[PDB]
Amino acid sequence: SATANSMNAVKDSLQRGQSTIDVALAAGDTITDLLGKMKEKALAASDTSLNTASF
Amino acid sequence: SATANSMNAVKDSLQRGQSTIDVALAAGDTITDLLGKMKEKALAASDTSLNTASF
């Protein structure tokens, strides 16, 4: 019975881990969007027909 | 998805190149007209029956 009761703490820990990963995935959506925009910036800047102000 | 989004910069570059060539062709119309007029000037000046003032 004591062994069965201690599984409540195990469940609490696993749910805490799922919450931590949820916050990391929410940050990762922001980071992958930012990286796609930065790739578009570097791709546009590699063109040599741009003037200095656009670069 | 990031690869598809970066094609917008490729399209921007190709349109910029078309604009640069358009300006060059507009200048080239002027230059070919001027060269045709200069050929008419040299052709008239090669005649030896002209007096000095006309030449």
Size of chain A, expressed as the number of residues it contains: 55
Which residues of chain B are within 8 Å of residue A44 when distances are taken between CB atoms?
9, 12-13
| Spacing of C-alpha B24 from chain mean position | 5
Contact B5 A36 (CB under 8 A): yes
Query: Are A38 and B8 a contacting pair, CB within 8 Å?
Result: no
CB atoms within 10 A of CB A30: 9
CA dihedral B37, B43, B45, B47 (to 10 degrees): -150
Contact A43, B10 (CB under 8 A): yes
> What backbone torsions phi and psi does residue B15 show, to the nearest 5 degrees?
-70, -35
Q: Do A39 and B8 touch (CB under 8 A)?
A: no
| Experiment type | cryo-EM
**CA dihedral angle for residue A5, residue A8, residue A9, residue A12, rounded to 10 degrees:** 180
Distance in angstroms (rounded) separating the CA atoms of residues B53 and A21: 93
**Cα(B38)–Cα(B2) distance, rounded to whole angstroms?**
55
Could you tell me if B13 lies within 8 Å of chain A, comparing CB atoms? yes
H-type alpha helices, chain A: 2-45
Q: What is the count of residue pairs from A and B with beta carbons less than 8 Å apart?
A: 24
Give the contacts of A47 (CB within 8 A, at least 6 positions apart).
B13, B16
Residues A51, B19 contacting (CB under 8 angstroms): no
CA separation for the pair B25, B15 (Å, rounded): 15
Resolution (A): 2.2
